Write a protein that binds this ligand. Structure first.
Ligand SMILES: CCCCCCCCCCCCCCCCCC(=O)OC[C@H](COP(=O)([O-])OCC(O)COP(=O)([O-])OC[C@@H](COC(=O)CCCCCCCCCCCCCCCCC)OC(=O)CCCCCCCCCCCCCCCCC)OC(=O)CCCCCCCCCCCCCCCCC
Ligand SMILES: CCCCCCCCCCCCCCCCCC(=O)OC[C@H](COP(=O)([O-])OCC[N+](C)(C)C)OC(=O)CCCCCCCCCCCCCCCCC
Ligand SMILES: CCCCCCCCCCCCCCCCCC(=O)OC[C@H](COP(=O)([O-])OCC[N+](C)(C)C)OC(=O)CCCCCCCCCCCCCCCCC
Ligand SMILES: Nc1ncnc2c1ncn2[C@@H]1O[C@H](COP(=O)(O)OP(=O)(O)OP(=O)(O)O)[C@@H](O)[C@H]1O
Ligand SMILES: [Mg+2]
Lengths: 105, 231, 110, 256, 96, 35, 108
């Protein structure tokens, strides 16, 4: 399928219009909305919500679509001693100690 | 952008940002056994068990219309918990509500379950509509894959994978291909792909690459302006 | 080593999913302009889900504005100069009544 | 036995206590498992809300009165109150005061029937506070790990043995009361932490307290026994023994 | 057949009371008034809901996800969102 | 790719032109269609 | 007796454990099958559900699944005390003992 030039932008951004005299007096009040259809656009409510359960749930959903992702999901839900799937890294204790146990060889 | 300048915006007669016990004249006052003859009170200690049963009811009565969709059942549970965890996480001191916050929230959820038992709750109708549009889009991707065809999502990923290789083959001085750089590459493709949906790609020019589309256009003869005058 | 290789992978996948949330919002926000010049029902279509929450308030007769909002900022802006400045209590239904009554040895329940 | 009982399967011992904020009743009774969309009937038939209130509020209330109809068949409710109402009903057209004097004994009869037919409700928070103070029970039971397997509590019919309770051989009291207002039941408990079970049997009776005319406690446990069963240990705990309790306090003998 | 059906008569209502013809005028007015008042109260909760759900969040507090926002993120994502996540996962978690 | 479900539940009494539940949003759409 | 599974009507089957070793295996499989459970292999008989990402509401969903598999009718008063794997095993034992002694299901 055709993609055009990556360096260029859509033509809507490049098209322009200029004014002249006389000019229509009318000032637009609202944007026209003749047909109530807003498909394929995500809700703007999903703006500044903090991290929560939906993040690790949707992560597994997209990870399970790949071979490597399926291995990560099954390993984490089985062989990781954590009281929550909302993993937050605030220290490198588990990272550094996992390196000293491997770099000895 | 714009901040509220009034420093007393959150002040109430009951304190700062107090939405649990607004100050009124008929304030709660204690009762003494020795001096009380009779009393008419509706408060009891049944809200905890009613909170547990309401969850079991709202959860089970909603799964009746999920048709065994396992991913929808787990999504609904996460959404149902966000509705029951409101009193535990809110800024409002729900343990200091005027006449018992536990009773108030339990009676509020019972009104929700009553609508749930009739399959008329707006959360239910919203779930059916959202899931049907999602399954229609997944069935479209499945029917294209069964035909050996490439999906629109797979073509974007393969196109994004090759642009990263091109941008990193010229990035030798630096070697940190940050997530910021990856994002603006994908967003630029997205804007051109989004504009390509309303104006598809005919030639090498690509999606929305025709200047003639933005010349003066008129409504077709078989579809005039239905709502207003044209001249 | 493989234990943290898979732990940090899922940890990154969680926060990459949150990064994609914030990114795709700013992407959709480009099509939103002049919130004051949209019709009522078109603004609710951009914020899909607000009409449904508005229906839940109506069907349960929670027609006291801001009762189920933790921070009823609109309620505070409306009462900046109100007599007996107060906002509605959290999750207050217009039909509930917690009034009590007692009879004591003194008159008027005292 | 619980007098108020609907076709609802869950929480039988709380059905009369729980006051739901429902406008009307749920379409179906509480499901015991996930069902199919075709299991339930969409858009219940016309006049469904009126039918539900009759079979979930009216009908179980009448079954409560019928189950305990033997507690209201006293000479006061049967002969005296209706006989008094008929005497003044013959002059109902003479003045308004005769209509009131003919309707008051009817309202008084309803109130005695309404209170006597209710389920016997003891102060359960007093009971659990009493069993959690015993060291032999707290060894195997705790509030956070206890669960109820069976509950029974019902009034005792007729007058009891006229040697253990001579109080009820009173012709003035028998004119108003046909039963003894005493109740008896048990409690099947289990502990999910220790794996132990016990049967908490109890007998109650109304007692006078601290005052001349008012009853002190309508359900005073004068006999409280626990048959604790464990893995291989069977213990028998006696919280309140009736031989020691009946020598100190006597029943109240409700009138009216 | 019973005489209770005589209440359906309006031809000869002037022979008994002639009150029905005037009371229903108030009832129709009373319904119109309550229609204007009640519809105003119940409908006008939307400006408060629309403003709070879009302007009441702050950075020193946690914004918790509602029911609708759970279903929209998990079961109402578009194709661009699906691509961006798999694009991030392939480049960083798989291809490093 | 696993074969997804054919369809979810379809409510027999909810349509886009005749929504079952009420809100000011649907009244707003019918209002602007009128004026 | 039939339920929808991924859009297909499948007859639901019931289990009868009547053995201590089978109850422990069922509860572990039950808790591991829950999508919110963390550290599924670290789960044992003495595992607190709180240590595996489960709260009071997750115990309700687990109790709801026990009613589906075993045909129990668990009251709302019993659910909030099921906070460990051992609690589910002992409760199932108490229900089987109650029906074997009293010939009826416990009060719901
Ligand atoms: C065309 C189609 C439509 C037709 C519609 C018309 C048809 C309607 C039909 C109605 C008749 C059938 C309904 C009743 C059937 C019950 C049959 C039965 O077998 O039941 C036994 C059954 C016993 O069950 P059990 O436990 O198995 O028995 C075991 C042992 O036998 C138990 O042994 P025990 O020793 O313990 O004995 C227990 C027994 C003891 O039974 C007795 O001993 C009998 C006592 C009856 C006393 C009645 C007279 C009271 C006054 C007498 C006073 C005399 C002394 C003073 C004289 C002063 C004179 C001024 O207790 C009772 O059953 C009596 C309960 C109360 C009855 C009295 C109600 C008084 C109402 C007064 C108004 C009467 C108006 C009548 C209508 C006429 C005008 C229109 O009892 C019941 O089921 C009770 C049912 C509920 C009570 C119904 C009474 C009426 C309540 C309605 C309230 C409104 C009343 C009317 C007011 C209107 C004006 C305001
Ligand atoms: C015309 C279109 C339709 C309009 C319909 C009516 C619209 C009403 C609009 C709201 C006004 C309602 C006024 C209520 C009192 C507000 C002031 C207040 O809260 O007092 C705080 C007051 C004011 O304190 P303050 O601190 O808020 O203000 C003090 C003023 N400054 C700041 C200048 C010093 O404090 C008190 O404690 C006084 C208590 C007296 C309360 C008197 C209330 C009597 C009326 C309430 C009962 C009415 C029942 C009617 C229902 C009938 C049912 C059949
Ligand atoms: C003399 C001839 C008969 C005279 C006419 C008698 C008419 C009686 C019925 C009309 C009056 C009913 C009162 C309505 C207001 C109270 C509603 C109510 O009952 O609530 C129940 C209430 C329900 O309890 P509740 O209202 O406190 O709430 C229950 C608590 N929760 C909600 C937590 C569950 O129960 C009772 O009050 C006790 C039983 C009262 C029985 C009512 C009258 C039954 C009479 C049976 C007559 C049968 C023969 C006639 C028909 C034969 C067939 C044709
Ligand atoms: N201290 C109190 N103050 C005000 N009202 C009360 C008080 N105690 C009870 N009430 C009211 O009287 C009713 C009866 O109280 P009661 O103790 O019998 O309830 P209960 O559920 O049976 O308690 P328990 O579980 O201990 O047996 C209650 O429902 C309540 O409305
Ligand atoms: Mg009690």
């Amino acid at each position: 399928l055709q993609w055009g030039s990556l360096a260029e932008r859509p033509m809507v951004d490049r098209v322009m219009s200029t004014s002249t005299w006389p000019v229509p007096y009318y000032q637009r009040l609202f944007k026209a909305y003749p047909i109530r259809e807003k498909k394929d656009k995500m809700s703007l409510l999903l703006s500044d919500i903090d991290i929560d359960d939906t993040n690790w749930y949707q992560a597994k959903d997209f990870l399970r679509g790949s071979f490597r992702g399926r291995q990560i999901v099954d390993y984490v839900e089985n062989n990781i001693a954590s009281n929550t799937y909302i993993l937050i890294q605030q220290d490198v204790a588990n990272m550094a100690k996992a390196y000293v146990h491997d770099i000895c060889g | 952008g714009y901040k509220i300048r009034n420093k007393s915006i959150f002040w109430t007669r009951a304190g700062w940002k107090n939405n649990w016990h607004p100050k009124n004249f008929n304030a709660p006052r204690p009762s003494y056994g020795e001096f009380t003859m009779g009393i008419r009170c509706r408060n009891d200690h049944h809200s905890f068990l009613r909170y547990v049963q309401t969850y079991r009811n709202m959860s089970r009565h909603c799964k009746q219309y999920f048709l065994g969709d396992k991913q929808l059942e787990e999504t609904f549970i996460l959404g149902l918990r966000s509705l029951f965890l409101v009193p535990y996480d809110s800024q409002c001191l729900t343990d200091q509500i005027k006449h018992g916050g536990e009773r108030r929230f339990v009676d509020q959820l019972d009104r929700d379950f009553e609508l749930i038992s009739y399959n008329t709750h707006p959360y239910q109708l919203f779930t059916y509509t959202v899931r049907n549009e999602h399954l229609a889009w997944k069935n479209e991707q499945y029917e294209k894959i069964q035909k050996g065809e490439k999906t629109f999502e797979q073509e974007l990923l393969d196109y994004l994978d090759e642009q990263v290789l091109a941008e990193k083959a010229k990035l030798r001085d630096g070697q940190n291909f940050s997530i910021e750089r990856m994002t603006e590459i994908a967003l630029h493709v997205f804007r051109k792909a989004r504009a390509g949906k309303v104006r598809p790609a005919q030639d090498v020019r690509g999606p929305d690459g025709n200047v003639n589309d933005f010349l003066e256009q008129r409504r077709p003869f078989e579809h005039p302006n239905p709502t207003g005058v044209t001249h | 080593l493989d234990d943290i290789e898979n732990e940090l992978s899922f940890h990154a996948a969680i926060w990459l999913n949150a990064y994609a949330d914030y990114t795709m919002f700013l992407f959709e926000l480009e099509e939103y302009n002049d919130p004051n010049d949209y019709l009522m029902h078109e603004n609710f279509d951009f914020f899909r889900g607000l009409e449904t929450e508005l229906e839940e308030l109506t069907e349960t007769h929670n027609y006291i504005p801001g009762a189920k909002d933790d921070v009823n900022l609109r309620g505070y802006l409306a009462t900046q100069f109100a007599w007996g400045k107060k906002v509605i209590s959290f999750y207050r239904h217009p039909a509930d009544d917690f009034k009590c009554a007692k009879a004591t040895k003194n008159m008027l329940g005292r | 036995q619980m007098g108020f009982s609907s076709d609802n399967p869950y929480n039988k011992r709380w059905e009369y206590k729980w006051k739901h904020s429902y406008y009307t009743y749920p379409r179906d009774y509480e499901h015991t498992e996930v069902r199919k969309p075709q299991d339930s009937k969409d858009v219940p038939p016309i006049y469904f809300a009126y039918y539900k209130d009759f079979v979930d509020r009216w009908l179980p209330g009448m079954n409560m009165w019928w189950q305990r109809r033997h507690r209201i068949f006293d000479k006061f409710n049967v002969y005296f109150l209706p006989g008094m109402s008929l005497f003044f009903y013959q002059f109902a057209d003479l003045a308004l005061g005769f209509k009131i004097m003919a309707a008051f004994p009817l309202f008084l009869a309803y109130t005695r029937i309404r209170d006597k037919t209710l389920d016997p409700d003891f102060k359960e928070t007093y009971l659990r506070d009493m069993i959690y103070q015993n060291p032999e029970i707290t060894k195997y039971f705790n509030e956070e790990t206890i669960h109820v397997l069976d509950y029974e509590f019902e009034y005792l019919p007729g007058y009891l043995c006229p040697e253990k309770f001579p109080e009820y051989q009173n012709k003035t009291w028998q004119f108003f009361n046909t039963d003894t207002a005493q109740a008896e039941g048990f409690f099947k408990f289990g502990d999910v932490e220790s794996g132990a079970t016990m049967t908490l049997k109890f007998k109650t009776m109304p007692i006078p307290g601290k005052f001349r005319y008012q009853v002190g406690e309508p359900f005073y446990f004068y006999d409280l026994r626990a048959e604790i069963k464990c893995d291989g240990v069977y213990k028998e705990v006696v919280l309140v023994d009736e031989k020691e309790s009946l020598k100190k306090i006597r029943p109240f003998l409700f009138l009216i | 057949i019973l005489d209770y059906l005589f209440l359906l008569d309006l031809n000869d209502d002037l022979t008994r009371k002639a009150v029905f013809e005037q009371v229903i005028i108030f009832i129709f007015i009373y319904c119109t008034m309550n229609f204007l008042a009640w519809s105003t109260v119940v409908e006008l909760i939307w400006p408060t809901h629309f403003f709070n759900r879009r302007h009441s969040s702050s950075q020193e507090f946690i914004r918790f996800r509602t029911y609708t926002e759970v279903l929209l993120k998990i079961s109402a994502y578009n194709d661009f969102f699906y691509v961006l996540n798999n694009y991030y996962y392939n480049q960083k978690l798989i291809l490093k | 790719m696993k074969k997804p479900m054919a369809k979810a539940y379809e409510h027999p009494y909810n349509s886009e032109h005749h929504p079952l539940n009420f809100s000011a949003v649907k009244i707003a759409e019918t209002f602007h269609d009128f004026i | 007796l039939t339920q929808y599974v991924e859009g297909q009507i499948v007859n639901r089957n019931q289990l009868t454990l009547k053995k201590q070793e089978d109850i422990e295996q069922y509860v572990l499989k039950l808790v591991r099958g829950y999508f919110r459970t963390t550290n599924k292999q670290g789960l044992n008989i003495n595992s607190v559900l709180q240590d595996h990402g489960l709260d009071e509401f997750d115990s309700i969903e687990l109790a709801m699944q026990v009613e589906e598999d075993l045909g129990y009718v668990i009251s709302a008063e019993t659910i909030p005390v099921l906070n460990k794997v051992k609690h589910f095993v002992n409760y199932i034992n108490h229900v089987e003992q109650f029906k074997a002694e009293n010939g009826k299901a416990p009060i719901a």
